[PDB]
Amino acid sequence: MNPPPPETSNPNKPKRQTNQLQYLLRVVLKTLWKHQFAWPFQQPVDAVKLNLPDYYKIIKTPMDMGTIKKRLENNYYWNAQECIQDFNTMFTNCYIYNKPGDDIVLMAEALEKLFLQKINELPT
Numbered sequence: 001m002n003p004p005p006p007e008t009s010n011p012n013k014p015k016r017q018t019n020q021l022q023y024l025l026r027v028v029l030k031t032l033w034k035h036q037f038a039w040p041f042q043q044p045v046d047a048v049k050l051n052l053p054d055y056y057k058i059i060k061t062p063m064d065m066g067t068i069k070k071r072l073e074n075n076y077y078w079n080a081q082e083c084i085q086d087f088n089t090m091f092t093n094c095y096i097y098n099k100p101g102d103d104i105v106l107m108a109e110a111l112e113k114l115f116l117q118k119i120n121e122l123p124t
């Protein structure tokens, strides 16, 4: 059984648009999205489809790039740091659920390096 995916809107949460959040959508996310190793991370983990019945028994803060993209499109975030924390939750989830050297981990590691390169300099 999959849990509900993370919210992409919340009327109790204030919205904001900043130059950095625009960049995180237009440049950072949409470039990572095209990476050859992006596809496992483009949607919430479907534990039923992927036969990972222990995934949500281990991962209690799920995050994926599909959710992040929708949050950026919704102006769900207050600032760029909030969005960056979601990326880091996504990468760390993969490292927590899996082991060093796993194919999926090698994929997340390559994406994390590209992500770090892209956020090294943000607009002002």
Ligand SMILES: CC(=O)Nc1cc(Cn2ccnc2)c2cccc(O)c2n1
Binding pocket: 040, 041, 045, 050, 052, 093, 094, 097, 098, 103, 104
């Ligand atoms: C042990 C295990 O299956 N771990 C897996 C497998 C898949 C599905 N997958 C595998 C290769 N490409 C996509 C994952 C997909 C997304 C995030 C994960 O943490 C995953 N972890």
